[PDB]
Amino acid sequence: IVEGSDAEIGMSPWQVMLFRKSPQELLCGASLISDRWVLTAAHCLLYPPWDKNFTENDLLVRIGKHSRTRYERNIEKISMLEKIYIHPRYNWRENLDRDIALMKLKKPVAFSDYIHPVCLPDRETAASLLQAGYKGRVTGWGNLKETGQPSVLQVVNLPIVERPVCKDSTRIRITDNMFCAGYKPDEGKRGDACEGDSGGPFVMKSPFNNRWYQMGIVSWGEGCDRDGKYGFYTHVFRLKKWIQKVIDQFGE
């Protein structure tokens, strides 16, 4: 995260660390949607042009973390993945369309003050919150600068941006399964996600039920915090049905 602040303790209890078994290393962000299921971006597991194709084996999942680098001895919970599931139509070949993946844990995690699921939006929640100008919150242990690594989990709040503006800022083809966020050069307020923040949650607080919903997944972007450019996220609502589907065909 670029131009973010430190997260307070228990502020984003669904925040997950996608951790490599060896080299032991931060992979990406993810999010807890239940006691056995995790949501991340497919580009965290499979990205062939970079020879990236992680299996269940290769990874650990760490829940309830605050320190980026330390073993939080009786706070954090580490888990084994049972199986991994990628959108059958994830477009790694051209624009990260359908950048989403589910991970089912070997054993259900127990909730605590530091570990709690986020909600998945309903059709109605998406329509009232997903509006240009509305602010969302992104979190992660990612890059502080486009070109260190925070000690503690970082946070930033950014306004959703109009589709045209999104379209006009890149040469990459934007699909209805994506949305862009950030401030405008005019606005002069900054911040964005950065490498290492990928697969994390873009969350919103419903003003009607005062619950936190996950609207997006940190997907792609050109550099971090560049003026006139925005971050892009997978549109969670639009892929909800694939999600139900897989929960329904194999888990919980």
């Binding site: 951790f19 078994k21 080299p23 032991q24 290393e25 931060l26 992979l27 990406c28 962000g29 971006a41 580009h43 965290c44 990205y47 970079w50 990236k52 650990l60 980026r68 680098t69 330390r70 073993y71 580490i78 990260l96 950048d99 992660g140 242990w141 990612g142 890059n143 690594q149 996600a193 950065c194 490498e195 290492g196 923040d197 990928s198 697969g199 994390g200 940190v218 997907s219 792609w220 050109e222």
Partner: peptide, 20 residues
């Protein structure tokens, strides 16, 4: 292009053998 990944420098604290 893609977040990609981040944090590779062993700068991390060893995790428990169990865990692993």
């Amino acid at each position: 292009x893609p977040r990609g990944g981040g944090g590779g420098n062993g700068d991390x604290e060893e995790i428990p053998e169990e865990y692993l």
